[PDB]
Amino acid sequence: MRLVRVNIDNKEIFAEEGKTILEVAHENNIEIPHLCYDKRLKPYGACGLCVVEIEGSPKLARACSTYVTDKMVIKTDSPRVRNARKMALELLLSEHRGDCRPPCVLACPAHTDCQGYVGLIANGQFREAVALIKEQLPFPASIGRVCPHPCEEACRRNMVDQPIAIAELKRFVGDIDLLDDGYIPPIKPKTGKKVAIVGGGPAGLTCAFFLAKEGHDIVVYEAMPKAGGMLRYGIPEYRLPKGILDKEIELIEKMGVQIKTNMRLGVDISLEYLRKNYDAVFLAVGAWKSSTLGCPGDSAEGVIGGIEFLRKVSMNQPVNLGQRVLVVGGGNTAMDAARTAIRLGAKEVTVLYRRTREEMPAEDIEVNEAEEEGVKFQFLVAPIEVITDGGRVRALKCQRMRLGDMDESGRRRPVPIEGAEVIFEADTIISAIGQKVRVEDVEGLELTRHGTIKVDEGTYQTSLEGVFAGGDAVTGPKIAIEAIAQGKNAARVIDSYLRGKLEPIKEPYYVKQEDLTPEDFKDRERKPRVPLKVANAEERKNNFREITSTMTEKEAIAEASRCLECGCMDYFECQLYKYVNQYDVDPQRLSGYKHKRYEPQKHPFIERNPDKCILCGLCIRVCEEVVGVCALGFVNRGFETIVKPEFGLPLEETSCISCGQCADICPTGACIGKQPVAKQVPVNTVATKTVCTFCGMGCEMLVETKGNLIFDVSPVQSNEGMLCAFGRFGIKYVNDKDRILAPLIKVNGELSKTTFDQALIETAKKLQAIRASYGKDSIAIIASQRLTNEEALLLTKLAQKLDTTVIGSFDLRESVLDRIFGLNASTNSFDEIYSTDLIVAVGKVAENHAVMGAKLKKAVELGAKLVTINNGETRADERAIATYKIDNTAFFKATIKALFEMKAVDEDYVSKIAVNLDELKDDVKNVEVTDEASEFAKIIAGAKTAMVIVDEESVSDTTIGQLANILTLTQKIGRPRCGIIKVTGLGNTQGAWDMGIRMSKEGIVKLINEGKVKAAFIVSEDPQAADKNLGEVLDKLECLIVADVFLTETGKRADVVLPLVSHVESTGTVTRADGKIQNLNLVLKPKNGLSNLDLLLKLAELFGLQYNLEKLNREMVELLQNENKYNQQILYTEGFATPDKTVHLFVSKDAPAFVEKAVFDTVKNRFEKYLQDKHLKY
């Protein structure tokens, strides 16, 4: 080898020869875009995103294909490269039909993940929904109570029946969160920076919330006695109760924000003080100066500003109303003042607006409600004079006006009508025509002509350096969520400025669908919206009690289940979106004809969408090169190309095995794997690495969860990075709602729920009664093979405590390997498949285990020779040099005789290492050698190294023994790259056998039939469902105790049913088929709070066994060491494990080579039944 010297982005690198530029840049922390590149597949070159400029070459070179040479200067971000990538991304977007974020998210000024928390509500994850809200909205309940909800105006469900009640759902989850201890987001470590926020309103509190999250020291100066702003001294109590506001502000203060109330800028505190002792200052003073009437006599007593009147009312200060009140204005202030006056005892309240009803800035619902309460309205009327008699207002003279022409807004301009004047009798006049920023609070700042503070757009920075502003002080009076969005943006900008580099807010570019029409939703089911509970007008017009009430949990879930899921499910993991955000792409210039070919499918696991396919070919290349099924392919040619299954059939009708590799390799959400949850929702999940337990290959995986629900499973890029149907999709049983979480005991002949202590006591007493009455060896323990090593060891210990040697499993087959070699284990490891010379795959190795099929495909591609022995067709027969279809073990006897005849057996060494050779020769002396047996013997003899892969769950023990004999005769045992590997049927078969569970189904059934066994303790097995003939056998047991995840058909006939938890809720140790020890991590906490090991430890402590996880692990390690099996990659290197230390050659009579058996494990049987019902393969 040679070390090549390259230069990538002005950084000298010493890379290795034969590497692509992509690999070198990846290993040297240089980012190169790529969409059609995978490490396990040959280069394709379609997308053209990885183009880099190489000095000395005129054309841009693909980094996924070009190999680094010596003295190579590579520029991966030159303007030529940037333009090429931008053009490629624009071309890809021109044919893209998707929705990066739903219209509900885009319509919200704070850009709250509306679809996210709506879908989380529909799944029952209320705390996760609240946490998602608090990522952009610190006040879920308060804002949900008071918000015009523009998101519902943009909701796509408007095209079907009625927009989703997003505000109501947010209020519901906010109420749930506030009912218990509130949710505080994680706080970054203290940065030692102090920020001074002036104002305790939504903008200031939002800035404090999003700056304390960054670890800064936050102090909020508030002039009013209590924080809240116009959410407290504006909005009345019947619309927003102040207890909720107090609770939210207390939650904010719990984050470390110091709110100094009664501190006023310019009166108690000067701006110089803040600028001197604080790094940054954010002003959120708001518009706190109501506009004067603007007509003569506006200063007469009896005329009061709207916001001042509402502040006096909220503060419970004495106000001077009367029988007759008129409110001048049309905003929220006018309507709130009118309704407050109605509730404060005014007999007549009349609202005067200069425009008409249609141009009323107030919401229609508020106006209608006030009309129900008794507020009268006069439109097209504006004030011109205040008739005051003795210094107190007597009436007000208005000039009627009419809509003449257009205005600055462009809709319509009202102009006065000459000769039209009306006198309205007035005891109180509330001028609520709008509010302006108080000039005193904003001294020393440059003011916009409108009176608001002038700030630089995108940075929220005032004229003074280090002083920021936002909210109503900058934009004028708006809705509260706009102020919250301003506060959040200003907080992000202030954090950037504090870090040193000030960066203006950059709005991302989203792919959105604007061609949608209601005709696209003509097939969706119409569901009624959630009813709104509104208090009676007569009863509510007298008190300040809240009008609307929060929805119930059932109504909230039913409402959130109405969502159409408009946003892309791959938003958080789409790379096309990331790349189009990284480059200034202008898609409109190239937009044109776009295909619409998505048709819904019935596949329960994988959903394909042709409209988001960038035609990278990754799914086809991974189904053909790695999996080897070749169920996908290109269809048509040119602009009409589409990825389709075999003959365009549904994925279930093809040979697809539902591995999900196509969904895992797709970059742009065209192919996705459906989440195992009630409602699909695109969420940012957390991934934990664990081990699949559905067969002995022990594939590692990353389980991605959000809350207590599992949302996805991804393969680990260890080797071929592959998962089969089980590991990828059968993790759905963790979220299953049919799981039992509390024990059941038999009361009055029926199973009913109880406590764990009582159930375990009953179990112990029943077992003790059986042992006492019927003596020793009368209790059978039928444990599943998916339990950890510690649980199996504990079950063996408990069986010793019960004086019973019947410790076995219904999934266990009769052993042959321990009578030949000494140990029932695989001699070699999965790492020697690649380096062996010949592979003998016996049974349905590829069909049962798809990952092993991919491993064999890779090994044969690397140079190995494959010989498949089976009875029917196999996917491995394509690349097999020799294929044998057999049904009897006479084939192996004939092979042994052929080996002996050609003198391919070194009799001296074999007789030295293997006793029982004369009998084997005598046994094979009479069989007839066939052509197939002779060919197989020639192949075996001519191979330097040989590995025999045996599917233990579909191969009889006679075949295994005969193959062991063949390996021993040709001296292919105990050496590197030679041996026998058993692919066990379940996750921890090897560990269960090593711990002491070594009784097969037949022995236990026989013992029950003779009447020797009178009770059974079944741990997560389903004898009744899997086998009908066992139903009578279970009738012979006096007592049956079942420990299962689900209430199976065999748990319904038990006396005690104990609940188990999934394998993602239990930490421990499992053993791979080759003997490798792997760790089961804790992805989720146990749903009932008790793990399987905890339950079994409680039961054992009831018998006087003092154990824990560490002690059991130590005992397991000692047990493995005593058999010379611990951390040994190759077995029998020194000598065999038989007492003679020799091979006891397998001599027996002929028998069927392969067997078909059921699965007794509960979860695996359930998932296999599910796949059979859905007509899927695996």
Binding site: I620, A631, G633, F634, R637, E646, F647
Partner: protein, 67 residues
Amino acid sequence: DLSLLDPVLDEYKGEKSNIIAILQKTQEIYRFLPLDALNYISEKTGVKKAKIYGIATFYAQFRLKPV
């Protein structure tokens, strides 16, 4: 019918690199490539079905609709 393709499949057997010729002869015989005929070819020659559909739809000379 499917027996009409029996001679062609017998002539181009032993190698899975002659699928385009088989498709052309099927196109000449049936005047089109029915999905049952493509299934029969896929079963007889041993080439994967997706490959057959791809090679068939690649060219404009092969059309999968009855005359």
